[PDB]
Design an enzyme around this catalytic site. Structure first.
Site, PDB file in Angstrom:
ATOM      1  N   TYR B 155       0.811  -1.220   0.000  1.00 11.00           N
ATOM      2  CA  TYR B 155       0.000   0.000   0.000  1.00 11.00           C
ATOM      3  C   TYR B 155       0.848   1.276   0.000  1.00 11.00           C
ATOM      4  O   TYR B 155       0.493   2.265  -0.649  1.00 11.00           O
ATOM      5  CB  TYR B 155      -1.016  -0.001   1.139  1.00 11.00           C
ATOM      6  CG  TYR B 155      -2.277   0.762   0.806  1.00 11.00           C
ATOM      7  CD1 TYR B 155      -3.002   0.477  -0.351  1.00 11.00           C
ATOM      8  CD2 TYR B 155      -2.754   1.761   1.650  1.00 11.00           C
ATOM      9  CE1 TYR B 155      -4.163   1.165  -0.663  1.00 11.00           C
ATOM     10  CE2 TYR B 155      -3.918   2.462   1.350  1.00 11.00           C
ATOM     11  CZ  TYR B 155      -4.620   2.160   0.190  1.00 11.00           C
ATOM     12  OH  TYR B 155      -5.772   2.852  -0.123  1.00 11.00           O
ATOM     13  N   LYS B 162      -3.631   8.276   2.059  1.00  9.62           N
ATOM     14  CA  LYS B 162      -4.884   8.053   2.802  1.00  9.62           C
ATOM     15  C   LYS B 162      -4.890   8.717   4.177  1.00  9.62           C
ATOM     16  O   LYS B 162      -5.923   9.205   4.617  1.00  9.62           O
ATOM     17  CB  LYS B 162      -5.217   6.562   2.926  1.00  9.62           C
ATOM     18  CG  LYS B 162      -5.742   5.927   1.644  1.00  9.62           C
ATOM     19  CD  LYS B 162      -6.946   6.684   1.104  1.00  9.62           C
ATOM     20  CE  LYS B 162      -7.658   5.877   0.035  1.00  9.62           C
ATOM     21  NZ  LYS B 162      -8.753   6.644  -0.627  1.00  9.62           N
TER      22      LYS B 162
END
Ligand SMILES: NC(=O)c1ccc[n+]([C@@H]2O[C@H](COP(=O)([O-])OP(=O)(O)OC[C@H]3O[C@@H](n4cnc5c(N)ncnc54)[C@H](O)[C@@H]3O)[C@@H](O)[C@H]2O)c1
Ligand SMILES: NC(=O)c1ccc[n+]([C@@H]2O[C@H](COP(=O)([O-])OP(=O)(O)OC[C@H]3O[C@@H](n4cnc5c(N)ncnc54)[C@H](O)[C@@H]3O)[C@@H](O)[C@H]2O)c1
Ligand SMILES: COc1ccc(Cn2cnc3cc4c(cc32)CCC4)cc1C
Ligand SMILES: COc1ccc(Cn2cnc3cc4c(cc32)CCC4)cc1C
Lengths: 258, 258
Positions: B155, B162
């Protein structure tokens, strides 16, 4: 309604002002069949209060007693086949636990009593209600306060108990997820209720919230009520072990009072 | 429906499988008038996809351009008086940013580009949409992933972005609360989408979630969709600056043992 035909038990309805009253209004509007609990000598009060909600039952339950909790689901299991949700809206600590300095006022028994009623009672309801809630997308929702997360004045042992409750919500979610049951909590902003008037300068704690939070207001029992409703719906089946803040955004700010 | 007559803009509809698709389905069912955005050469795809939703407009918006974002609310402001909600469901990072070791793969530009599109774009939409959203209990909802909270494999820069998004949600909530606008995020569990297939062993990350989370499953776009819907309703007016996990309870556990 998004709760049509669902069978939901509501605890902690005590007043016109109770959070549980707001939860009931929301759930009724959404077509749930509701049952309510009451303690000792509030029988007549609660029966009259929740009459408007067409309850399938109004039964005695003092969560201090394991026996009463077990009897609750016996009596309830008579009038209902299965049960879709449990709404925990119960908290207590002895008054000596909420005055001033935490280390001053804290006691072994007040600590015990507060956890027993405000935290343990949740897993107790989960324990006894479990079989009636198996495999029907069932739901549990507890009520909590930010006093669990951060140290606050006056909240003291109740704050510690609320932390206990929130972990119990989490462990109850791990335990009951295999049965399709979801377990969550709503962290409500301060609201003028009967429990609330058990602390000293509430009008201003309530005004502090109104001043310092993003939406510059206080939450009403409908805002909380409507959220609990959602968390007991088929729409929320992806949500468990969670704490949803309904506090006009209070939780996400610091120093927001320039 | 609980979104009857509300005017809501939906970004990031790209596929039958998109989270935005689920959000649309939910909001349509609840009686919202919807508008959709699209990037460059996906015009025809998106127009056909969202036809079923009766959109009041299907307009171009590449959130890389400040001009297009400003033009979006000009064109939108023509067909609508005010606007009730914005749904941010947009994320991107260059592919070189999602392979293996974070410190190996990270670059100054990939970091910049990911934040620009995945995080900044939110405050941009808020900036331009603000006047159309004044004083009508308006709503913003961003989509985020737990990669923001905890360090994860693959990620990488998207996870950092995020986290940026989630803080932006919080600062946008403080900024827009005075106008009665609520700002929130939904942290979705992994879902098999077009963005999702941009990482390598998704089938198993998706199976790990199913194994290790309390409800022992994966969330579908309706579970997410239905939650976004709620967060844009009058029922959620006590909620802002919040991240609601819709991940089958994944967030609340550690050591689902295997
Ligand atoms: N008032 C607030 O500011 C606020 C904020 C966040 C969370 N909460 C929580 O919401 C819940 C509902 O409280 P409220 O504010 O509506 O107040 P309330 O006084 O109306 O309700 C509290 C309930 O606790 C129940 N109770 C106490 N001891 C009990 C026992 N031994 N057995 C069974 N029931 C018992 C009472 O019947 C009562 O209905 C509580 O858990 C409370 O901590 C309140
Ligand atoms: N798939 C998952 O597992 C998951 C989990 C948590 C959060 N999310 C988030 O949900 C959102 C939607 O993703 P999705 O999973 O539905 O996949 P998706 O591929 O369908 O949606 C991503 C969207 O980003 C849009 N996009 C890319 N660059 C853009 C740009 N420059 N301007 C405007 N739009 C642009 C694309 O058109 C696309 O529709 C993202 O924020 C994503 O991070 C996804
Ligand atoms: C930090 O300031 C506060 C904010 C809100 C509240 C209201 N409040 C919320 N849950 C409660 C439970 C109880 C009481 C009050 C409760 C009395 C015994 C049981 C209380 C305090 C001190
Ligand atoms: C645990 O690991 C994961 C869980 C979910 C996802 C799915 N996922 C969520 N947001 C996203 C954004 C992008 C992509 C994928 C996205 C690619 C382009 C940009 C990805 C990973 C690595």
């Amino acid at each position: 309604g998004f709760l049509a035909g669902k069978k939901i038990l509501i605890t902690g309805l005590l007043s016109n002002k109770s959070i549980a009253y707001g939860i009931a209004k929301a759930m009724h509007r959404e077509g749930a069949e509701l049952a309510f609990t009451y303690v000792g000598q509030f029988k007549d009060r609660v029966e009259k209060l929740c009459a408007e909600f067409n309850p399938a039952a109004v039964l005695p339950c003092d969560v201090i007693s394991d026996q009463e909790i077990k009897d609750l689901f016996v009596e309830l299991g008579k009038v209902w086949d299965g049960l879709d949700a449990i709404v925990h809206s119960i908290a207590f600590a002895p008054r000596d636990q909420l005055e001033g300095n935490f280390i001053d006022c804290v006691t072994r028994e007040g600590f015990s009593i507060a956890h027993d009623i405000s935290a343990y009672s949740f897993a107790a309801l989960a324990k006894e209600g479990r079989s009636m809630m198996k495999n029907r997308n069932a739901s549990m929702v507890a009520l909590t306060y930010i006093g669990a997360e951060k140290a606050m004045p006056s909240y003291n042992t109740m704050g510690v108990a609320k932390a206990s409750l929130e972990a119990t919500v989490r462990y109850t979610a791990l335990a009951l997820g295999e049965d399709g049951i979801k377990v969550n909590a709503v962290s409500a902003g301060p609201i003028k209720t009967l429990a609330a008037s058990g602390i000293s300068n509430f009008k201003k704690m309530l005004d502090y919230n109104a001043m310092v939070s993003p939406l510059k207001k206080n939450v009403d029992i409908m805002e909380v009520g409507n959220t609990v409703a959602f968390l007991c719906s088929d729409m929320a089946t992806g949500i468990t072990g969670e704490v949803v803040h309904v506090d006009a955004g209070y939780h996400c700010v610091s120093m927001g009072n320039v």
